[PDB]
Symmetry: C5
Subunit: 386 residues, 5 copies
């Protein structure tokens, strides 16, 4: 009864286009806040963050004011999208391909005129993904909200801290925080400042999954590569193992690239270490192969080039019936002679391959300690996850 | 005729914004229920549940009341979305990217004013997927329904048990149940309690498909690994078989990861067993390779390091014309001597590889019995499916 | 002219919510039919059928009746979605994620009041896919159409046979038929029966493509496996060929799984045969490997275990200067002795591998004849396609 | 000014449902044409053609007629979707899953009443893809446009030739033509003929990309297979090369299948040649393997079966101290005897493998000349592209 | 207050269809500009550019003019989509499949009547991708904006330079510029010129990512191929390494093809070099195989064909008790003779393989220098990125 009379009374001359202020010269104060419920996805490939959030717009409507005594039993009313004025607040850095993911809901109003609007949304935002310290990386993905057509002189957009009380842990990501910042900016379009509220979702990646799925294979690859660098040139399977380890490493680099963006602002350290040890082992497999097929015939066949020889040699010095039996026995002695000789090529391949092992060791230690001493602390993270 | 007169009469002063209650101070009772028709998909990768469901809202409209005698032959009327009042009930934990998948249908009303609303929907919900006990896992995926803008003081949302009479078995999933729970909650947004109805789809996975597609290959891999651990170091194909089994196991781990989420709250036991036996076999292939190329030349070459030797040895003890023929015959005797010797390295690789087999056996038994004695009972499940 | 006057006359007091019947107590007869134009897709993975169809609703509107003499030259009128009454007929088992794929078109009306409505649609329906007899399988995919809010007492939904005159052959599927069935059902929701019309698209798969793409490789794999089972244990490449055939077979099983659902109600016979011959060949490769590395040293080394020996043996029985030359000549005779011996292990591996070949042959014949004598007759199908 | 007065005047009694003709008994002439801008995609997998096109509807509105002198300065007016009458012309064979991709734009009208309507669209159409002559194939993909509810007695849909002046070459496809055909048809639905306009996009594929990406590998595979067929049975790597070439060929067949539909109306010649040479090389690898492990022991071991022997033989005929040295010398002579023998199996494998090479050559020549003499001429196409 | 009175006053007789000009004979000047915020994606496969942009339409409405003194405190008003006139400006070369990605926002108006409209959008445009100079390529992707139904006589569409002040670097692409061009064009549809504004996004690709992910493997492949060409025919692993390098190269070519379009207007130089060195190494592996199995038996077996022999030879010339011991010793001498011979086939394979290495070197140098001296300068680009 009184609800019907009130709804009829309020919409007599109401104009949804009108900014609801008694003084048209004064701006309208809008308290905009956010409630994060769940981080639904982080597409590092497309640099997209898919979140579930409830916005919170609170403002005052000078015309929607009634007296509870006049209308007993009704302390609230609801007004849908087009029946009253709502701020045109939206997400600037949206990637939704509709550019507005809000599900328009009812606006709740009470006698004093305080209007609440909590539109939910599956918001897809564009946030820059940093993979320099992968996979022990923290991402600061931004959500920039603001009014499109209402400026500071017409809409004083204030900020209230974001709400994470209802947040549901994702499992693959850990929500460090979601701080907000209200900033006043000017654009090369318009003479009025347009305030914005930027909420910076700061979240840290969880590494147990990638610790047992990815890093264990990686340590296996490293150990196999060290094993390859330990086998001598004459080893039968040192060339085969090098080749096989190469192909596995390459496949696994492609795996890393599948889930990582093509942005050139930085390179995943894991992939950089991959490529490094990759060139190192490939160079070692190639050197062993050139030593085994070109230097084999001559004890000083690979030493003919002036440069190759002097390099290796000086650098190593610095760094360290009767006649019948006659014929057959002579030929057998020649066989024995031809079967049991090694020359400076075995020693050279051992030196070169030892140098390759040393180069590989310089890279493993440096990368391991560097990833340990990363801005997203690795020691503390593993202490937490292990 | 009378239908036209009735439709004209009912919408005289009706306001769809008005909550239809004679006493505006009293809340409106809404009986919300659900009818599950088919589980359409379970994207474990994105942790999404795609279901087909018919909602069931039943309430009372004080203004839509007629007398059948006055309007003979019309016991019902239908009102579409915007012509009368419907509750703003929706799915909180939605992932639809429209955030409302309901197809708005007609509201059915009878003379007493009892209004029915059964909007169908392809609902995409966010539910946490537990893969700890994969693939013998049960999932409790939640569907949280509630009114967005109407609170307990305005909408007493009651719950009626869900309906599965029309449910169609998926084939890959078995519907254990769909119990409901009505809860009253407060939010850091608003001073009124907002009741919700949470239906917990509890469903168990079917394993015949994964029993013959996945587990049979797994047992094959395990048997091949045991075979690898049984072959001696001198075996020609023990190093090749280890490598090949490694690559197959890795591929198959990647297969598991393709269909499993990256959540770090737990690890699939199948994948954990993969990684375990993987490191075990790789360590065994590596040990055989170091024994075959570094220890080969010297009978006590690998025994030079103090630590390696003492470990193996003490632990094993605790755990257990004439002159022409002269020359040629002497050299042939030397050949015979050089061709028929084995040393402590064969025994050490047998001990080490035997220890690797023992470690692999400790893991196989433990994991097999553990998966047998899982909270989602495995013995009963196989009894059902086999 | 007269068209304008007629359009003005008809919408004087028309109410689209009103069911257009002179007697409100009587139901309205709606003849619902279907016209299938093209089967666009069959996603066996998600069990979805994507079709192009034109619905056909024919009914009678008591209020849209004019006299052609009064309005010469106008025998028809068109009314869009919201201007007049249309039945709320829709597809129950829809998977569209809008749950209504109809493109709302104009309703055609003639002087007698007979209204036609032929909304086209790309309908996505959920139909259970049976892969038991893959790839010689027929699918009965259902399309259940019905009114959502109008029951039998208000809407007598009759069925007219479906129209395939304009159907376009898909090429991968053959349309055996599309019979219809009108059924009256009750639901745990409502006191009125709600009739439905179910059209059962019965279509058979075409196998020429899969006959030359898939089955030819399969027969190749089978022949290679038989070849593996024919080679003796001492064969150099019998262990390598077994391993390679294994990996190829596994890859090809994964190919089958890529296009097949994970439903556990049945298993593709092709995949079952895969897994069978897979375990058989793997067991044979494993047996040859255990015979070649453990039994090699001793002529009765594998015969030490009591059980292994008795099994093989009894089952086979049921189933079937001078002194210098002295030294060197003696050692050469010892070499000759050591170089030219085979023992009961060659015979045992031949017996065991022969038994593996017999097991493989029992499965090939049984599966080939079974697939020949399938409910979707294979002999007639190949006669048609070959 | 005059524009406002004109817009007010025209919509006085206008009814968008009314067909705008002075004589309601006469049909309305609609000139429908098309402007193709870009072929955006050809999904051969789903048999879908994605095009960018501007429709062109031109007709006459008897009621939208003004006098320029009465309204100076306004020679045109614009009317959006629902303000005036537009024909319900749409694409019958659409695959858009909205079934109408037109972006509704303004209708342009001039004093004589001539109305223009040029709605743009990303049209997805279903067109049958012929891969028989792949990749030198031409596709005739149809676009069938027509009015849904207006028939010949009410809408005389004329055709004007399509416009390609603004067309942008795709690069992967060459637009041979886009001829149109206006046809009058009847349906098993309705008593009135419903004319249609069918534009047949006839386009030819470009093969430089597939000439250097695909065909070069193919010729490599063919040469490797010929090499395999040239190596003798005793060749060490003839069995390995055959196996490796097999696996590569299979992978590359799967590549062809990835981009080709599963339609069984025809088979890609490239894939047919693949499968042919595949069975040929596999049969040759298998024959060499049976000759190398079963016939090896006995010079007439493979000649025991009556059938195998007679076949090969007749068909080939039609087609073409002292005693110490005694012992040791005798055994060495036996070694020499056992080391240097070949028998009828080498000759038989050469004959059989030569026959396999001949079968492979019969197929290569036949397929190469056939693809040369294809309905989509290959010689002229390569002359153009090379 | 005054805002309400103003909003009521302005919409008294306003017609959104009316072009807002005092003189209907004169055209309306519309200043159209653009603000690029972020390049979201470049799908080279489908030749699509996904951008985030804010349009900027500025024009004048003769009817929306008020006096600030009459309405104090209100200097601006906002009008949504359908309440006033907006130009029908859209993107001609759109690929959105809705063909309009603009999110319709409010139109801002001030007392003088100057109307601003800044609709944001995720615009998907079709732009031709040039991969000739991959990956050091620059793309000129066009955005053609224009009015659909308003021509030059009615809409003088002027251009203002695009705004990149708020642009966010993508990371994978570098924004060289976004120049604009206003052009007047006629169409085979209409008698009036329809001006357009074309903004040409000129952007350069970043190569650090592809420099360490892609090019490093490529140089590895090249070095391995050179190594293959250095090994002699008798090398044991020269045939295996060639085969393995072949398969890796092919896989990596497929990787290039995965991210590259099938357009035949040009070929990626990287892929062309792939195919070249691929045929070269395959020809070398094939030649070594024919030399090793057909020429082996006879020292002049491959020299029998007249052509093969003369080619190689002339081109190379231009380019450069007692009797017992008797028997056994004689047979041993025959063994020695048979074991230590090479013939003109080793020299011929060295010559041929040397020629293959020379052909490979002619291609490596030519392609490396050509890519260095590309229109998108490579030396400067690497100087920037390295
Ligand atoms: C509210 O309305 C009641 C009843 O009309 C009246 O007595 C009271 O004065 C009003 N209060 C205010 C603050 O206007
Ligand atoms: C219903 O209407 C009939 C006819 O007007 C009247 O006789 C009867 O009293 C009414 N019943 C009620 C319960 O109002
Ligand atoms: C604006 O309005 C004020 C107040 O009515 C009036 O005094 C003044 O002359 C007006 N100015 C113009 C330029 O019309
Ligand atoms: Cl009508 C209008 C005026 C200004 C604007 C823009 C200024 C800031 C940046 C985007 C939006 N808010 C957009 N529309
Ligand atoms: Cl106007 C309004 C008031 C309250 C709410 C919220 C309170 C609970 C949680 C989501 C929704 N229901 C949302 N909108
Ligand atoms: Cl208002 C209303 C009443 C009944 C129904 C349901 C009964 C049958 C099954 C689905 C639909 N038709 C749906 N809505
Ligand atoms: Cl109301 C009505 C009448 C007829 C038709 C159909 C007849 C032809 C084929 C499709 C459409 N045009 C569709 N709707
Ligand atoms: Cl009503 C009408 C008239 C003309 C046009 C076209 C002419 C130019 C090219 C596309 C569009 N602008 C489109 N619609
Ligand atoms: Ca991710
Ligand atoms: Ca799944
Ligand atoms: Ca399919
Ligand atoms: Ca394609
Ligand atoms: Ca890209």
């Amino acid at each position: 009864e009184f609800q019907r009379k009130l709804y009829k009374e309020l919409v007599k001359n109401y104009n949804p286009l009108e900014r609801p202020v008694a003084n048209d010269s004064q701006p309208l104060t809008v308290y905009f806040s956010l409630s994060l419920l769940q981080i639904m996805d982080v597409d590092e490939k497309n640099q997209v963050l898919t979140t579930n959030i409830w916005l919170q717009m609170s403002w005052t409507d000078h015309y929607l004011q009634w007296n509870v005594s006049e209308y007993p039993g009704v302390k609230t009313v609801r007004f849908p999208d087009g029946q009253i004025w709502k701020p045109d607040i939206l997400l600037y850095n949206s990637a939704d391909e509709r550019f507005d993911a809000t599900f328009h809901t009812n606006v709740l109003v009470n006698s004093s005129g305080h209007c609440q609007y909590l539109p939910p949304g599956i918001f897809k935002s564009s946030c820059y993904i940093d993979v320099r310290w992968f996979p022990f990386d923290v991402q600061h993905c931004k959500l920039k909200f603001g009014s499109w057509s209402y400026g500071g002189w017409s809409l004083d957009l204030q900020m209230q801290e974001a709400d994470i009380s209802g947040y549901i842990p994702n499992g693959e990501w850990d929500l460090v925080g979601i701080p907000g910042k209200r900033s006043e900016r000017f654009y090369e379009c318009c003479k009025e400042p347009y305030p914005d509220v930027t909420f910076t979702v700061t979240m840290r990646r969880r590494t147990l999954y990638y610790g047992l799925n990815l890093l264990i294979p990686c340590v296996l690859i490293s150990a196999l590569a060290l094993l390859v660098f330990l086998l001598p040139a004459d080893s039968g399977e040192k060339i085969s193992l090098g080749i096989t380890v190469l192909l596995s490493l390459t496949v696994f680099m492609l795996l890393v690239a599948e889930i990582m963006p093509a942005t050139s602002d930085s390179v995943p350290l894991i992939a950089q270490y991959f490529a490094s040890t990759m060139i190192i082992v490939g160079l070692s497999v190639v050197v062993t192969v050139i030593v085994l097929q070109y230097h084999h015939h001559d004890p000083d066949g690979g030493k003919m080039p002036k440069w190759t020889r002097v390099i290796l040699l000086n650098w190593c010095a610095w760094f360290l019936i009767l006649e019948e039996v006659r014929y057959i026995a002579n030929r057998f002695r020649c066989q024995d002679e031809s079967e049991a000789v090694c020359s400076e090529w075995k020693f050279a391949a051992c030196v070169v391959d030892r140098l390759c092992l040393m180069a590989f060791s310089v890279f493993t230690i440096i990368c391991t300690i560097g990833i340990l001493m990363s801005a997203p602390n690795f020691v503390e993270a593993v202490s937490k996850d292990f």
